[PDB]
């Protein structure tokens, strides 16, 4: 049991390392996909950007 426990400790250490790095690579993958989506979205912004002073849609009178 002591031999098995030593071997298991080594294996679990390596596995923890691999699991951490795997989760962080998955995180980075998702963030890179988000960045790609944002990069495509920024092409749809009109020239000169948005008029942040006014409302985009004016949906009624102001008398």
């Amino acid at each position: 049991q002591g031999i098995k426990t030593v071997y298991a400790s080594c294996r679990y250490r390596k596995l923890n390392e691999r699991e951490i790095i795997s989760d962080r690579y998955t995180w980075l993958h998702e963030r890179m996909l988000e960045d790609e989506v944002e990069r495509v979205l920024l092409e749809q912004v009109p020239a000169g950007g948005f008029d942040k002073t006014r409302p985009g849609l004016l949906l009624g009178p102001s008398t």
């Binding site: 849609l57 949906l59 009624g60 009178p61 008398t63």
Partner: protein
């Protein structure tokens, strides 16, 4: 076929908002005009009031 229904519901909501704004504006203006007229009526009745 789905985007048509979506756009329809969308424009319906927009029309609802516009109509709501218009009706609220009209009601507000009517109420304010009525209040002003009542105020002038009160003014003349206070000019006519009598006693001490």
């Amino acid at each position: 076929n789905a985007f048509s229904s979506f756009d329809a519901c969308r424009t319906g909501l927009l029309k609802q908002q516009s109509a709501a704004v218009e009706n609220s504006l009209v009601r507000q203006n009517m109420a304010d005009v009525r209040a002003k007229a009542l105020f002038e009526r009160r003014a003349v009745l206070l000019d006519l009031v009598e006693g001490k």
